[PDB]
Every structure is written in structure tokens, then in C-alpha cells.
Structure 1
Amino acid sequence: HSDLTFCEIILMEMESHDAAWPFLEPVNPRLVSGYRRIIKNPMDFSTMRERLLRGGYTSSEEFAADALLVFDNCQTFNEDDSEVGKAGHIMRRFFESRWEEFY
């Protein structure tokens, strides 16, 4: 319904955001040491993309839960002053403000 039409706007705008590069694809645990043991429920934009296209979101609140999970995992694994962590705060602050402009 009208809830999930804006989830497409935010996800599209989040995908094309400049600071979205750490979260476009799922984290590769073979390449990132310690990520498999620290992050229980990983989540990224592409995973939210394929679920949203298939329709697996019942309400907008599920979409926000996956989005906040991306930045929670980013803050949990990475330092705040790291290159991945710096982009996470930019993407997180962009989402919470853009999510505010509708709800």
C-alpha cells in the first residue's frame, strides 16, 4: 500500500547516496576478519532490495527494522572514526531524517 511506496523512494535514494558504498552488497565474511562471529543477523541494501521487490514487507515498520539493522551492525563492527564507520553515520542520519519526512 501507500506505506511501501516511500520505502522504494528511500531505498532508491539510499542506494544512489554517495556514502552507500559499504552497504550495497552483503559483507563478505571470507574477506572481513571477525564479521561472522560479531554480527548475528547481517543485512544490507541489496537484501532489502530483493525482498521489497518480491513483496516480503508487510508494513513500513518492517522495512525500517532492516534499515536500522544495517547501521546497528555497522556501528557494532566498525569504529566510529573508521572509513566504513564514517559512511555508516552519514547513511544512518540520512535515513532517520528521510524517514521523518513521512512519519
Structure 2
Amino acid sequence: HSDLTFCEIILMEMESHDAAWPFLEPVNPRLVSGYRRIIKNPMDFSTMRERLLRGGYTSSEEFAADALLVFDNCQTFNEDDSEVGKAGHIMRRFFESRWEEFY
């Protein structure tokens, strides 16, 4: 039980982070040219939240795979010095940081 509890804590702290604005909702491919073609498996914090409330995470590690997917997609699509990229680096470092001081 404590596994998914810590997932709730981490996901809530990510949802409310100052750098979280790019990842709160699915990327709108109609508005981001090329995103559909470049990113095979989109992921975002609201999709993770919907899946977590609905109970659809078996382990803490599937959760961590979805978070890492958020940041891998970010680095794949955005230059490291773009605004979304800078936000994504702050969020990724925050996630690995929080994740490790649990497990």
C-alpha cells in the first residue's frame, strides 16, 4: 500500500510544482507541429493521475516508467534551452530526487 501512497505524494508535488505547466495536460498535436510524428507514446501528469485514481498501476515501477516517459518525450521533442525543455529538466531532476529519497 505504501508504494502507491508515495506515488500519490510524488505526483501531487509534481502537479503543483512551478515548472509543471508544460506537463499538466496532454500535448495538443493540433497546436504543436510535428508532435504526432515525433512522439510515439505521449504521457502527461493528468493521464498519470487518471490512471492512478482508477487503480491502474500495479507497482511503483510502472508509475515511475510513466514519469520517465514524460521527461524522455520532453527531451526528445524540445531543445534543452527551449522553455519547455528547461521546465522539463527541472521537473525530471525533481522527480528523480524525490523518487530516490523514498526508495
Q: Which TM-score tier does this pair reach, normalised by the shorter chain? A: over 0.9
Figure out how many residues of one structure are paired with residues of the other and give that number: 103
Q: Post-superposition shift, 1:83?
A: 0.4
CA RMSD of the aligned region, Å?
Answer: 0.3
**Residue 50 of structure 1, CA deviation:** 0.3
TM-score of the two chains, using structure 2 as the length reference: 0.99
- Kindly state the Cα deviation for residue 2 of structure 1 after the two structures are TM-superposed: 1.1
SS of aligned partner of 2:31: coil
The alpha carbon displacement at 1:66 in A equals 0.1
What's the counterpart of residue 25 of structure 1?
Answer: 25
Structure 2: any 5+ residue segments left out of the alignment? none
What is the rounded CA distance, in whole Å, between the counterparts of 1:50 and 1:101 in structure 2? 25
Deviation string 1:77-101 (CA, Å, 9 cap, x unpaired) is 0000000000000000000000001
Distance, in Å, in 2 between the alignment partners of 1:78 and 1:4 is 30
SS of match in other structure, 1:25? coil
Q: Distance in 1 between matches of 2:94 and 2:62?
A: 18
Q: TM-score, normalised by structure 1?
A: 0.99
For each residue in 1:2-53, what CA deviation from the matched residue of structure 2 results, as whole angstroms up to 9, or x when unmatched? 1000000000000000000000000000000000000000000000000000
Per-residue deviation, residues 47-83 of structure 1 (Å, max 9, x unmatched): 0000000000000000000000000000000000000
Partners of 2:64 and 2:56 in 1: CA distance: 13
Aligned partner of residue 43 in structure 1, secondary structure? coil
Instruction: Name the CA distance, whole Å, in 2 between partners of 1:84 and 1:92.
Output: 12
Counterpart CA distance in 1 for 2:2 and 2:92 is 23
Q: State the distance in 1 between where 2:82 and 2:28 align.
A: 18
The runs of 4+ residues in structure 1 deviating greater than 3 Å are: none
